[PDB]
């Protein structure tokens, strides 16, 4: 029922714009994409691990940019900005890949260019997380999300008040509740033909947050396997 207020319509546009400006190859991702050769990532695999280390940095960096284009993120202490980014990075990157799931070739596109299979992402170091991301990919196609809806989810993941060690807990929560509200209102406006769109979308926050945690455990097992190999931003963000 309730559609978005004037103030929320502007937040919607601020968060929509931060996403489209930091999303690799914007609209052209379908035309830019180049399938990873099937000989890379069969059955740890160091040749596939190398393709993935090449795009990990730019992907972390695009999330940093997305947050910086959000005024409320910029009103925060730099020590909170760091915790928030370190919490959502793998989440936002897993949603960006998953919304570029192609059921025709069953591939996710990473960095707006590299199409990969379940197995390549799995054997290239991400192990069982690949299955989680691919599965959210399969699941999120039914919902036909637009950029605005992908952005509001990112903002909800980013504005997580429960991040270990953060100081402005109450204000981050206020910021997340603002986003959640505009989001619900925008789903109403967008008149989707799915009863209970809103709640079913929100629970995808669960999926993403598990992918976050599941990745933080895989990083302990990427360290008993493949450290001079991991790019420098990857080690900052995914360690403490």
């Amino acid at each position: 029922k309730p559609e978005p207020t004037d103030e929320e319509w502007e937040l919607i546009k601020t968060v929509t714009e931060a996403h489209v400006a930091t999303n690799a190859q914007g609209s052209h991702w379908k035309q830019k994409r180049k399938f990873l050769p099937e000989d890379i990532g069969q059955a740890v695999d160091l040749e596939a691990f190398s393709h993935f280390t090449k795009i990990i940095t730019p992907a972390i960096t695009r999330v940093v940019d997305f947050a910086k284009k959000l005024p409320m993120f910029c009103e925060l202490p730099c020590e909170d900005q760091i915790i928030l980014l370190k919490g959502c990075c793998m989440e936002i990157m897993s949603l960006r890949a998953a919304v570029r799931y192609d059921p025709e070739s069953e591939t996710l596109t990473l960095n707006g260019e590299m199409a990969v299979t379940r197995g390549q992402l799995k054997n290239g170091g991400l192990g069982v997380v690949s299955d989680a991301i691919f599965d959210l990919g399969m699941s999120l196609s039914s919902f036909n999300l637009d950029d605005t809806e992908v952005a509001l989810l990112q903002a909800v993941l980013l504005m997580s008040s429960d991040r270990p060690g953060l100081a402005c807990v109450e204000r981050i929560e206020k910021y997340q509740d603002s986003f959640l509200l505009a989001f619900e209102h925008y789903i109403n406006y967008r008149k989707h033909h799915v009863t209970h769109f809103w709640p079913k979308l929100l629970m995808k926050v669960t999926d993403l947050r598990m992918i976050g945690a599941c990745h933080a455990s895989r990083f302990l097992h990427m360290k008993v396997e493949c450290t001079e190999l991991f790019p420098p931003l990857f080690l900052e963000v995914f360690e403490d």
Partner: peptide
């Protein structure tokens, strides 16, 4: 630790 992120966050 958070040097690159502090660079990325203070940039532009």
């Amino acid at each position: 630790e958070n040097a690159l992120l502090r660079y990325l966050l203070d940039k532009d």
